[PDB]
Design a protein around this ligand. Structure first.
Ligand code: HEM
Length: 110
């Protein structure tokens, strides 16, 4: 099976390298990037991200709900456009299918 856990880990590395301030919105604020995998808050968040990707592939993703929840953290289209790029990098790094359409789907509600 596609190693989505590894893709997501690389996704967050790319995302927070390019936009460190995004990390401040999470329960793992301030944690060194090389230590995220040993952080309990990060582990929970990464697992939810993996679940969302598997839901999108499986046909059950709630893009409206995910969008609404991100608006609820003042995260919007600009951040998701930036995320699209980081996730494309992470997918390519793993020979994984591109997830741009999943991000576009979320973007359609932002
Ligand atoms: C690849 C695009 C992204 C995906 C698939 C994604 C997915 C998720 C999921 C599944 C959750 C949990 C929602 C829930 O529990 O109901 C979440 C929460 C969250 N996301 Fe994202 N996200 C993405 C991009 C971003 C970006 C760019 C930011 C910018 C800061 C962000 C900030 C947050 C924050 C602050 C939370 C709440 C975390 C908490 O409850 O402590 N996300 N995201």
């Amino acid at each position: 099976m596609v190693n989505w856990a590894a893709v997501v880990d690389d996704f967050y590395q790319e995302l927070f390298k390019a936009h460190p301030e995004y990390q401040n919105k999470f329960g793992f604020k301030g944690v060194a990037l090389g230590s995220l995998k040993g952080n309990a808050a990060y582990k929970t968040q990464a697992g939810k991200t993996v679940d969302y990707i598997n839901a999108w592939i499986g046909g059950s993703a709630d893009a409206a709900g995910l969008a609404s929840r991100h608006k609820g953290r003042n995260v919007g289209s600009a951040e998701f456009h930036n995320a699209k790029a980081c996730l494309a990098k992470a997918c390519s790094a793993h020979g994984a299918p591109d997830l741009g359409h999943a991000i576009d789907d979320i973007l359609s509600h932002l």
